[PDB]
Design a protein around this motif. Structure first.
Motif, PDB file in Angstrom:
ATOM      1  N   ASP A 177      -0.560 -10.132   0.277  1.00  0.00           N
ATOM      2  CA  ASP A 177      -1.592  -9.104   0.586  1.00  0.00           C
ATOM      3  C   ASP A 177      -1.633  -8.588   2.046  1.00  0.00           C
ATOM      4  N   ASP A 178      -0.496  -8.649   2.718  1.00  0.00           N
ATOM      5  CA  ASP A 178      -0.272  -8.036   4.030  1.00  0.00           C
ATOM      6  C   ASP A 178       1.201  -7.572   4.071  1.00  0.00           C
ATOM      7  N   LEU A 179       2.160  -8.485   4.127  1.00  0.00           N
ATOM      8  CA  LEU A 179       3.561  -8.076   4.041  1.00  0.00           C
ATOM      9  C   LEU A 179       3.928  -7.544   2.634  1.00  0.00           C
ATOM     10  N   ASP A 207      -9.245 -15.186  -2.420  1.00  0.00           N
ATOM     11  CA  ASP A 207      -8.462 -14.229  -3.156  1.00  0.00           C
ATOM     12  C   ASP A 207      -8.170 -14.715  -4.572  1.00  0.00           C
ATOM     13  N   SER A 263       0.358 -14.506   5.985  1.00  0.00           N
ATOM     14  CA  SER A 263       0.527 -13.057   5.981  1.00  0.00           C
ATOM     15  C   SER A 263       1.396 -12.512   4.871  1.00  0.00           C
ATOM     16  N   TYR A 277       5.688  -4.513   3.846  1.00  0.00           N
ATOM     17  CA  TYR A 277       5.571  -4.371   5.298  1.00  0.00           C
ATOM     18  C   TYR A 277       4.818  -3.105   5.708  1.00  0.00           C
ATOM     19  N   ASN A 278       3.777  -2.754   4.968  1.00  0.00           N
ATOM     20  CA  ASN A 278       3.075  -1.483   5.180  1.00  0.00           C
ATOM     21  C   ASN A 278       2.291  -1.474   6.485  1.00  0.00           C
ATOM     22  N   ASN A 279       1.920  -2.641   6.998  1.00  0.00           N
ATOM     23  CA  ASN A 279       1.143  -2.746   8.223  1.00  0.00           C
ATOM     24  C   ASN A 279       1.991  -3.129   9.393  1.00  0.00           C
ATOM     25  N   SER A 280       3.301  -2.979   9.268  1.00  0.00           N
ATOM     26  CA  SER A 280       4.221  -3.469  10.251  1.00  0.00           C
ATOM     27  C   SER A 280       4.946  -2.250  10.725  1.00  0.00           C
ATOM     28  N   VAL A 323       2.159  -6.238  -0.872  1.00  0.00           N
ATOM     29  CA  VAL A 323       0.907  -5.680  -1.467  1.00  0.00           C
ATOM     30  C   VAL A 323       1.255  -4.968  -2.787  1.00  0.00           C
TER      31      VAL A 323
END
Length: 156
Positions: free
Chosen positions: A66-68, A12, A63, A79-82, A70
């Motif tokens: 670029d996961d929690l 990244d 995490s 937290y878009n994936n949570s 973004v």
């Protein structure tokens, strides 16, 4: 990276975290519950600067960027994936200052950015930015497109 087919290793670009992931991994259970001046950013798109201590216990450190957290073009996704987020005041759900880069109103026909800092659309865009729910507007610079604001609890 990716200069040639002799080396196809890629990491990244763009994201960064302060303290470093290596520093945060070394913290004891007491200290990881109260990490100060945590900064997670993306050089191209924005950053978040937590203004209270953050409890990172149990969060897999890799995490966070670029996961929690973004940053995309004119977009902050937390937290878009949570499915769930922690309670107010717990975890990352604390006071923070967020900066978003290259935010400019768009021409309604081409959707190209209006970059004229004296266009009358600029003041209308600030006034609408001031209205975003659960944000406390701090500043907007029509010349750079930097928008800065605070949140009382980053995930609410």
């Amino acid at each position: 990276s990716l200069d040639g087919i002799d080396d196809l290793e890629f990491v990244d670009e763009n994201y960064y975290i302060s303290p470093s992931l290596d520093t945060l991994a070394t913290l004891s259970k007491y200290e990881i519950q109260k990490v100060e001046n945590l900064v997670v950013g993306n050089k191209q798109y924005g950053k978040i600067e937590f203004l209270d201590p953050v409890d990172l216990s149990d969060i897999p450190l890799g995490s966070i960027c670029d996961d929690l957290v973004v940053f995309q073009p004119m977009s902050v996704l937390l937290y878009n994936n949570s499915t769930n987020v922690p309670e107010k005041g717990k975890g990352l759900n604390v006071r923070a200052r967020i900066s978003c880069y290259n935010c400019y109103p768009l021409d309604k026909s081409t959707r190209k950015p209006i970059k004229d800092p004296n266009h009358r659309i600029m003041e209308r865009y600030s006034e609408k930015l001031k209205k975003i729910p659960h944000t406390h507007f701090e500043s907007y610079d029509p010349a750079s497109g930097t928008y800065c604001f605070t949140v009382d609890h980053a995930l609410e």
